Amino acid sequence: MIFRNRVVDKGQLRNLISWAFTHYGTARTAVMADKLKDLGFRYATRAGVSISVDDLMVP
Amino acid sequence: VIPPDLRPMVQLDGGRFATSDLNDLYRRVINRNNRLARLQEILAPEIIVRNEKRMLQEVDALIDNGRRGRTVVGANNRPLKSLSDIIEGKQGRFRQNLLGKRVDYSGRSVIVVGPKLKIHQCGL
Amino acid sequence: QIMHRAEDLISAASNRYRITVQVANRAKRRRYEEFESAEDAMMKPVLRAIIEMSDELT
């Protein structure tokens, strides 16, 4: 029962998943990072994002 | 000598009946053998007998168009795939015809994006 | 669920394969035993196989 709050990254996924499955029945946790994963979407969606041109910014 | 049904003679109607590529080895080989003996008897000069014995030992080609005489020629001067050229390369029967048979019952369709479904299960 | 919490039984029961294999062994017969379309066996022969393992596997 364990809240984490930081930013997220790749890795902290990565690990994350780990630390879950590392103590949780494979499927039980393999199924996790899927609903919230597909929620990656729908958010990211909502924030939405994309290039510009000068997206290609040049310092 | 291998059985016939398996080197078989093939069927395309029209007269283009492909046959095979080792029965012709034979074709050689039997003739070089019989015609020869069929010298023996008449016991004519070895110039046509002892010289054929090489055209007889030449059966080596049957066993390999390719080690050690120049190979014999095929429809396209190919190394007429020797009987010892059927299960030899990765594409030569052998493993690919056993370790890697093709096989039946299954699907082969383009895998386009389709993330809607879950993971533990695929979408047929 | 249909199939999910079954990721532990096999996981924690000595030789896993081995499990499977028996499990089949169930399977095969515990379809086999009844060819009267018993709807218990209306579903796939394994999955039962499994489960009644499962819930005897306490």
**Spatial distance between the Cα atoms of B72 and B15, rounded to a whole number of angstroms:** 25
Three-state SS at B56: helix
To one decimal, the resolution in angstroms is 4.5
CB spacing of A31 vs C5 below 8 angstroms = no
CA torsion through residues B59, B63, B67, B72, sign: positive
Give alpha helix (H) positions in chain A. Answer: 11-21, 26-30, 35-47
Mark A12-47 as b/e (b = at least 16 C-beta within 10 Å): eeeebbeeebeebbebebbbebeeeeeeeeeeeeee
C:1-58 residues touching chain A, CB 8 A cutoff: 4-8, 11
- Method used to solve the structure: cryo-EM
Q: Which tokens hold the place of A32?
A: 């996790």
In terms of Cβ atoms closer than 10 Å to its own Cβ (0-12, 13-18, 19+), residue C19 is middle
The number of beta carbons lying within 10 Å of the beta carbon of residue B68 is 8
Q: Which of A32, A35, A38 to mutate to test the interface with B (most CBs of B within 10 A)?
A: A38
- Provide residues of B within 8 Å CB-CB of chain A: 115, 118-120
Q: Which tokens hold the place of A25?
A: 């029945």
